[PDB]
């Protein structure tokens, strides 16, 4: 309902450190594009080691004890990011847009999806800031022990391209809410609304170096906060190959604390006697929601022989009526893809589900050449050990197996090694519940998808990461146990 | 004391069967105290290891006689097996004692008891480890269950062996994990007895596994095999660092370290001294100068400094020496001979700088020591007393905390402020106060910055023994 | 599977004050039934209030500061209550022997019902000794605060005769694993098992004084304690009108802290999409269980009108096969009732079904008139505002209603005072958590009845109970909160 | 301050409209300062409470608008409310001291920052209230619902009106629980006020609800009244011991009290006196004498005894007096004259004893006090300073804890040791340590023994607002 801000201009594009922008000391820049219209949009920092290696000089000096920061009240904390929620609240709309203009998002989405999700994040932890508790032990009679939860100190941060605020406030609320000082680098494809952040930041009223921003590349400032000896915790999402990276680094560096969530083959197991007109709606825009680029997206999608030929066509409709075009457009919900190689790589395996068997059965290749529009593909007859199925596409495109049994596709859903998020659809009692015990998924919807909340912990299983985000359990990540035991005479 | 106790176990433990090593291969750990050979044991490697991971994967699946066992049932084993660690008691004793060269009295009475009360501690998290119900929206349920990993890697050094040995078992029981047990070395003996036991109460077979070897064999093959889902490390800093390099280069399996560190040990003005100079004997010096909780640093006022390394030293060689079976003696040998070589050298390391010591082989007190020297930059790992002065509560505070070696620390005063002020500051993951080595099965052990990441003995033991799998529920 | 013991003796008969049998200071002594064989079993002490006083002044010093019981470890004492669940298991034909000879119990029943439930409930508790955890709470820069869980002191028990030992236990466990003291009084018609248990937690190595059992009658001995200005804390399982007499009295004398649980009308809903052999198999032991007296017994049977005319034939059928007579029989489900103005007060309300338009269906009158044996009797056509399905019937009855509505059904079930306990029988996911959601009940089993653990908590909603038992929330009733706050210089 | 500010609300407050007593009847607050009245306010009784009960019955029940809401949007309504309350500050210290005499800085700084701070804390709480989940079988789910109780029901007495209000209904409203609040009839004014805010925010109405009166009337009909299902009381001891009973006999309704106490107050040889002296100043002589923490005990030990009356007395008579929205001033006046009739009689109370008093009406200091006197053996409760001596830490013990009113208690030591074994000793539901009345939204307050039972204030609060429904489910 908001108004599209089409021509609306960047006006921050720097390294944020200390409350202060600056020009990298390489002097160098990069620009980004906005993938809607391949376009530049502008040209930002360039960050690499020595800007990285100044950002941390500055959140370890924040951290220090006695610093302002340190000392505040447990809820003069907490009361900042509130008030830095309420900032983000005003400048929704202009957020929202530079989301858009950077990453293809409709405008839509970025404004009641990724936006409600980071302020509402935002408030959860503001309120666990002074809830932060120990426990105290009984141990002998003559002995007083008890546990504190203290700050773990400068956390870096690393966020990927497919939620560029969201999943980059996921880590700042808590981390924050526990008085640590963060250094941020954002993926260079979409920078813009990290910086701005920036800007709220500072007017939310935190101390100068609490949180720095050096935008850069992977290997040159993402690396550098991997390994740097001063960071004392990581926080990784991304790709699981760059995630087995950043924790062999920080293991070689510093044996620094690393959480990583890193998305899988996330099945979308839908049983027969399932409320379908649901269970296509949600597993469309599951796989589809976004471009198709998420974490959450349903790779693989089980259906039993019951209701398995009538699914496949109920799909194919939805995936037709499924808008695509420009972002700022009202009646959008998928827009272009992101970049090139991702365009090419996904265009890859459709023609190898073309080439290995699977029954296509809407939008074989892609359409709308100026841009980086996909037609929104559907795939039958999948089988295990096919690539759509067996691999992690990002675009548009949902290969739909058969089922028969519940063991047999508690089986092969478990097959993988990406246990991050499991769909299961069933208006049975039984099913549901024996389903979502056996599946090994870090998270398990059940007649809905990508029902995300500030409260609930989002993690991923076997290799799709290590802890949780997004939950009281969040906490313990941002956090050190210490033992305190004393001795009387 | 058992004069002649002989050896029954030495192979690798998988389905509580005993194995000979498919490389055919064994090797022999030899008696620390008086240099000889024990016996020889199985040596297991790669092929040895793939199969005890298999085997606990197995008795982890669904539906196996483990998975399906009633909570309070999983924890009635834990109290059964507990149980024959306590009949047998002295036998294990004995070969910790055999095995390691510590008095007996330390092995039966810490060790043992140690190991037997965190077996009971966690026999009664079996049914008391709960989840979240969560609020989220009206027609919405959301929850979380806190399910077992799954095969779970332990590793750990001679210092504790056995008990070292326990802190990981015991949680990783009490949740349904199975495990893969690569003990060390040097101290193979009472790991596998442990085995027998295991067996002997009804566990059913797969669910532990022990499989002995060395460190760059079995232990190496433990942190990157593909199908063990957590690791959990006793030992070396720089032996973590590799752990932890294999296990995110192979399986992103997630791994604890218990690591080592220089343990701050601070005196104030206001120090019972006879306390404080005592406790600082006894954590330092205590089973042979070895231990993760040593005090390598000793920070004393400067109106009891120059008191202090007076008592500290009178009353530093009044341990005696002797056989480790002896009522006599509270120190045993040691182990290796890098540790020996490294030590005395070390010894000669302080006085390079200025440091008067004031008091060979066959026990030393320093002093007058500052930061800047080997006897304060590095882990000591061996009986020795670096004494420093200081004036202020904040210099200590930074000069004990800018290492990065935060795992335990001792403060020791009578006062309310300077006891919680420091209290506070002290980077470590667990800081006593007028006592040292106040260990409790309640409390979670664990070190702060490079001494580690994880904990160990406490209910947030638990947390690094389950995976938190959320479920959403939407209704119409 | 146990040889039955029937010629055992009563071997323990007096008040266990300080782990020491005494005569009653009154002299008078009073003597117990065996429902099964209307027959004296033995006469015990009959407690009074200056037997009372004696024995609180013994837990007083029992919890004395510094006394041998306050100084134990935490495990130490949690190490005895394990030890004495070991004793419960080595006389665990002794104690379901006594049980049933005081009660009819059947002694399948006693041995793997009532014992079984008792030794897992000791064991559940000794767990929690050394994990009683208070908390350290964040409240400014310079203050330290925390808070101890300790024990609260003396307290009283006072336990019912459909669960003697079991519903006793209930409140010996945890109150014993926080490290506090107890002075019980077991129903007069079953107090055998009560002063047995005395023995063995001597023999458990109990100190003297920690537990003090004084047999009596409610007047006499269980206001005694109700108002007894030195006890800190009761527990009441029993009738909803002497629940309400106990914490008034409580109320007026000292303020001690009071939890009770008092049974109601427990509604058994039935859905038309159930497993109706199921619903009829545990509808049916869950009325009828124990000779029918349970405080979570069925009161109110709700069915579909999809079947419930079907599940009228199917219950007749169950409650006709169901085996009544000897309860030291093998063969046996349901033996005699309890006592006299109880086979009266149930043979009542039947006739009020006749006499009120309730369609019976199976044993309208009793039989075997030797002892208490009555026909197990099931009734249709029941509307809500009969007596039957109104009131608290104990023997075995089962009134069957209708209903139509999910939405029908949750107001009709919460349309009383006593939610205590709910079942709940569909295949249905969302009519499965709808229901458990909006019903009333402190317990809501589903595709099950009695379902009780040592870890799930039970207790009373609305006029039902205070607080809850057999938990970790049991733990809250059994001590009392400190906030410590330091301020530094 | 405020100089003549016109008072807007006095009805009693239903589903957000302002009521006419069904009695018509009213009764007039008066300004305990200056004696002169201020307002009528509609009195309220049974049947204007049996309408409140079922306004917030029905705003209750199941869809109505309010059980409907998110928990972060109800928390999100009460993070509105303390705003308002936030934003009209002045307008209730303004009312808080024309309606009960208080310094209108300890009306605008503590008062209502506790009420803004209490109320932001519990705004928190909304959307992380978890249950549990159960392990129980393999084949079972089971887990543990916090579902609100219900129509609860708050009666605050004239200490301090509206923190005392807040305390309850912060908790109670982060949670499902719908209220009907009696407040006092000395202080009904912030009450009310309250109530206007409360339909600002939009606070879907029958939430909260409002209704003025007396104690016999409106307060005995709460709580006695069947539909209400929790009770939060704070007021005198005997009065509780009235709506316990009341509510025993009635609906079995839960009920929460906070009673009062002689709260013991303890100052070893080694204590920072002028902090000792000072802070067992405010607790006893602040707000008038009259408050819940009140130290009607002051135990000090012989080495400081005879000193500590010294500078107790010459600073005791330091707090000036006069008008209440003068800033000179920190002491107003009291509200009815059963407490000034009641104190200047106490005051000769100890006279007949043994006592020697240290320093009449328009601030008094008693010493050489022992236990068996009325100085010491009842609530003041009112400004007077009985002061004790001592020997023992046992002593101390025994005596502080001989009572039967354990509420708060205060030590005043360095010594590390002398600290904690008091703090463990003493009976206190709070026990402060080098501070007095050092209350915060995070701790948790409540009472031992007689000083009530239940606990607000904390985390522990939500556990008084919550009913816990177990929930297992069986799988074939
Ligand atoms: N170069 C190749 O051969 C090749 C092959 C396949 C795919 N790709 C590309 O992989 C990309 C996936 O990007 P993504 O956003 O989904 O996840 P990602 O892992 O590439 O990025 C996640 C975050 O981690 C940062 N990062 C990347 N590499 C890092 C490193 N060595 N050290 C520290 N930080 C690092 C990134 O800046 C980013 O912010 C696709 O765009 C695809 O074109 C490249
Ligand atoms: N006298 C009557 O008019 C009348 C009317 C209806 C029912 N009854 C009887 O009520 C009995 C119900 O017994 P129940 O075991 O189910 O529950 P209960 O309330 O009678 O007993 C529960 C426990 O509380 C004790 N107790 C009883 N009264 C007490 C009191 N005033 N103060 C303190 N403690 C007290 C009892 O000793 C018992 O251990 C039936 O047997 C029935 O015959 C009597
Ligand atoms: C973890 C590891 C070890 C222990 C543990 C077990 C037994 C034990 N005995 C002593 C002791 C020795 C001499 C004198 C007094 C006490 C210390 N002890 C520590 C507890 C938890």
Known sequence: LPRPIRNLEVKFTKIFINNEWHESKSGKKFAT????????????????????????????????????????????????????????????????????????????????????????????????????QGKTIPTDDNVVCFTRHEPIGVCGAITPWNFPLLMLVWKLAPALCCGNT???????????????????????????????????????????????????????????????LVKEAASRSNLKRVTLELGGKNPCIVCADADLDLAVECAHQGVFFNQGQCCTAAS???????????????????????????????????????????????????????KEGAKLECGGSAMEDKGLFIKPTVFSEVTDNMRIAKEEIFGPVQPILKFKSIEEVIKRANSTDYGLTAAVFTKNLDKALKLASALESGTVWI???????????????????????????????????????????
């Open 33 to 132: 594009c906005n993938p809607s219209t391949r376009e530049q949009i502008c040209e930002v920092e360039e960050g690499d080691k020595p800007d990285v290696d100044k950002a941390v000089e500055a959140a370890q000096v924040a951290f220090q004890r006695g610093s302002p920061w340190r000392r505040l009240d447990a809820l003069s904390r907490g009361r900042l990011l509130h008030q830095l929620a309420d900032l983000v609240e005003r400048d929704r709309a202009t957020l929202a847009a530079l989301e858009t203009m950077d990453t293809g998002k409709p405008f839509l989405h970025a404004f009641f999806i990724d936006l409600e999700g980071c302020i509402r994040t935002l408030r959860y932890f503001a309120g666990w800031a002074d809830k932060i």
């Open 300 to 354: 693989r999608v089980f259906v039993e022989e019951q209701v398995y030929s009538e699914f496949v066509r109920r799909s194919v409709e939805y995936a037709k009526k499924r808008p695509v075009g420009d972002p700022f457009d009202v009646k959008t919900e998928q827009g272009p893809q992101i970049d090139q190689k991702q365009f090419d790589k996904i265009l890859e395996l459709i023609e190898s589900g073309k």
């Open 447 to 489: 007649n809905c998808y990508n029902a995300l909340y500030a409260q609930a912990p989002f993690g991923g299983f076997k290799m799709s990461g290590n802890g949780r985000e997004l939950g009281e359990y969040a906490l313990a990540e941002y956090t050190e146990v210490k033992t305190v035991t004393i001795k009387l005479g």
């Open 182 to 244: 963060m250094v941020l680098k954002p993926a260079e494809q979409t920078p813009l609304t990290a910086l701005y952040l920036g800007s709220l930041i500072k007017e939310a009223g935190f101390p100068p170096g609490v949180v720095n921003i050096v935008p850069g590349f992977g290997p040159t400032v993402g690396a550098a906060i991997s390994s740097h000896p001063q960071i004392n915790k990581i926080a990784f999402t991304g790709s699981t190959e760059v995630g087995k």
